[PDB]
Design an enzyme around this catalytic site. Structure first.
Site, PDB file in Angstrom:
ATOM      1  N   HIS A   9       1.004  -1.184   0.091  1.00  0.00           N
ATOM      2  CA  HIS A   9      -0.152  -0.039  -0.117  1.00  0.00           C
ATOM      3  C   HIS A   9       0.736   1.125  -0.075  1.00  0.00           C
ATOM      4  CE1 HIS A   9      -3.167  -2.790   0.934  1.00  0.00           C
ATOM      5  NE2 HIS A   9      -2.621  -3.043   2.238  1.00  0.00           N
ATOM      6  N   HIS A  68       5.391   6.782   6.987  1.00  0.00           N
ATOM      7  CA  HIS A  68       5.041   6.432   5.358  1.00  0.00           C
ATOM      8  C   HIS A  68       4.660   7.682   4.780  1.00  0.00           C
ATOM      9  CE1 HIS A  68       1.320   6.430   7.522  1.00  0.00           C
ATOM     10  NE2 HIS A  68       0.716   6.631   6.452  1.00  0.00           N
ATOM     11  N   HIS A 112       2.028   8.977   1.307  1.00  0.00           N
ATOM     12  CA  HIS A 112       0.918   8.998   0.215  1.00  0.00           C
ATOM     13  C   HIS A 112       1.502   9.911  -0.949  1.00  0.00           C
ATOM     14  CE1 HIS A 112      -1.680   7.133   3.230  1.00  0.00           C
ATOM     15  NE2 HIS A 112      -1.037   7.761   4.105  1.00  0.00           N
ATOM     16  N   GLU A 136      -3.335  13.714   1.152  1.00  0.00           N
ATOM     17  CA  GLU A 136      -4.612  13.314   1.747  1.00  0.00           C
ATOM     18  C   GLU A 136      -5.359  14.443   2.450  1.00  0.00           C
ATOM     19  OE1 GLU A 136      -3.817   9.632   4.194  1.00  0.00           O
ATOM     20  OE2 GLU A 136      -4.360   8.671   2.227  1.00  0.00           O
ATOM     21  N   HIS A 173       3.345  11.130   6.798  1.00  0.00           N
ATOM     22  CA  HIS A 173       2.655  10.573   8.061  1.00  0.00           C
ATOM     23  C   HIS A 173       3.644  10.155   9.181  1.00  0.00           C
ATOM     24  CE1 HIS A 173      -1.353  10.615   5.873  1.00  0.00           C
ATOM     25  NE2 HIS A 173      -0.920  11.687   6.414  1.00  0.00           N
ATOM     26  N   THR A 227      -6.084   6.752   8.048  1.00  0.00           N
ATOM     27  CA  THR A 227      -6.601   6.977   6.728  1.00  0.00           C
ATOM     28  C   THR A 227      -6.614   5.765   5.585  1.00  0.00           C
ATOM     29  OG1 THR A 227      -4.422   7.856   5.535  1.00  0.00           O
ATOM     30  CG2 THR A 227      -5.887   9.569   6.838  1.00  0.00           C
ATOM     31  N   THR A 228      -6.166   4.736   6.363  1.00  0.00           N
ATOM     32  CA  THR A 228      -6.323   3.572   5.478  1.00  0.00           C
ATOM     33  C   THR A 228      -7.040   2.509   6.316  1.00  0.00           C
ATOM     34  OG1 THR A 228      -4.177   2.448   6.378  1.00  0.00           O
ATOM     35  CG2 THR A 228      -4.011   3.497   4.545  1.00  0.00           C
TER      36      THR A 228
HETATM   37  C1  LIG Z   1      -4.453  -2.305  13.439  1.00  0.00           C
HETATM   38  O1  LIG Z   1      -3.566  -2.424  12.357  1.00  0.00           O
HETATM   39  C2  LIG Z   1      -3.240  -1.110  11.759  1.00  0.00           C
HETATM   40  C3  LIG Z   1      -3.110  -1.083  10.443  1.00  0.00           C
HETATM   41  C4  LIG Z   1      -2.936   0.419   9.987  1.00  0.00           C
HETATM   42  C5  LIG Z   1      -2.646   1.286  10.855  1.00  0.00           C
HETATM   43  C6  LIG Z   1      -2.299   2.758  10.540  1.00  0.00           C
HETATM   44  C7  LIG Z   1      -1.065   3.445  11.150  1.00  0.00           C
HETATM   45  C8  LIG Z   1      -2.813   3.213   9.315  1.00  0.00           C
HETATM   46  C9  LIG Z   1      -2.723   4.520   8.627  1.00  0.00           C
HETATM   47  O2  LIG Z   1      -1.609   5.005   8.616  1.00  0.00           O
HETATM   48  O3  LIG Z   1      -3.801   4.940   8.179  1.00  0.00           O
HETATM   49  C10 LIG Z   1      -2.694   1.152  12.357  1.00  0.00           C
HETATM   50  C11 LIG Z   1      -2.916   0.067  12.702  1.00  0.00           C
HETATM   51 ZN   LIG Z   2      -0.859   7.912   5.927  1.00  0.00          ZN
END
Ligand SMILES: COc1ccc(/C(C)=C/C(=O)O)cc1
Ligand SMILES: [Zn+2]
Length: 258
Positions: A62, A92, A94, A104, A117, A196-197
């Protein structure tokens, strides 16, 4: 789950597996700079990264995460809208397929080329998995990227990307200094929101910096050479891995600056 950013598994589909996608405090949002409220009550923002210990970089199909040792208070975010101490666990990005999209959050509906982020979790909850189940469990520092001059602090990320081209690949990434990714100013907007994911959990205090960082064309072009797919699968370039702005609903965006 098999979610992504394509026509058949993208953001318009996520609500079927993650119903909170239509919730009351979803992210990202458009930041209307003329309706955000200066809040003199905000305490100074403290970014304490001098002891940060990076470990690894990973392509998760992703985006790519740079992960940190979060077993002690080595890189933390304090102050601002936050109560207590939030530990850096990963960052990370986007980004887009074109320089006018990729972020985003938007600012007065303006999109940036990418968005960084830096994800932190509230140490009162003991571990990251517990933190994401709490309404004040995370603090994410969001930083816009625009294309101009190169960001020297980003180049070591750029130059390891060829080694994590495809989903599932990871590489050693020790001794990386995330201070090199910050703009000059720590002026920010803040509001309560979500991941946001997927799983889109509503556990985030968002802190979005006013000042973008500049990165070069060559730097963002190397982001766009990453792959969503695993090795040996048909190539799908990792681009446009951003969720669009969601309804603000019953939320006020506060600003740290007049
Ligand atoms: C519970 O598992 C997770 C999966 C993704 C994330 C994050 C930190 C997602 C994002 O950046 O939007 C956290 C927990
Ligand atoms: Zn993000």
């Amino acid at each position: 789950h098999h979610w992504g950013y394509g026509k058949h598994n993208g953001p318009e589909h996520w609500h079927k597996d993650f119903p909170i996608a239509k919730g009351e405090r979803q992210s990202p949002v458009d930041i209307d700079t003329h309706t955000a409220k200066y809040d003199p009550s905000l305490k100074p923002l403290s970014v304490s990264y001098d002891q940060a210990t990076s470990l690894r970089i990973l392509n998760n199909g992703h985006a790519f995460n740079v992960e940190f040792d979060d077993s002690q208070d080595k890189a933390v975010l304090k102050g601002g809208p936050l109560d207590g101490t939030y530990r850096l666990i990963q960052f990370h990005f986007h980004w887009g397929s074109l320089d006018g999209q990729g972020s985003e959050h938007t600012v007065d509906k303006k999109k940036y080329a990418a968005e960084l982020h830096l994800v932190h979790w509230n140490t009162k909850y003991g571990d990251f998995g517990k933190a994401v189940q709490q309404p004040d469990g995370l603090a994410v520092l969001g930083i816009f990227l625009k294309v101009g001059s190169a960001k020297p602090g980003l180049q070591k990320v750029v130059d390891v990307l060829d080694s994590i081209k495809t989903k599932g690949k990871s590489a050693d990434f020790t001794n990386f200094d995330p201070r090199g990714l910050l703009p000059e100013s720590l002026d920010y907007w803040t509001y309560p929101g979500s991941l946001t994911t997927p799983p889109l959990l509503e556990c985030v205090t968002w802190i979005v910096l006013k000042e973008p960082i500049s990165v070069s064309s060559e730097q963002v072009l190397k982001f766009r050479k990453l792959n969503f797919n695993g090795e040996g699968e048909p190539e799908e370039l990792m681009v446009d891995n951003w969720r669009p702005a969601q309804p603000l609903k019953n939320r006020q965006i506060k600003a740290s600056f007049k």
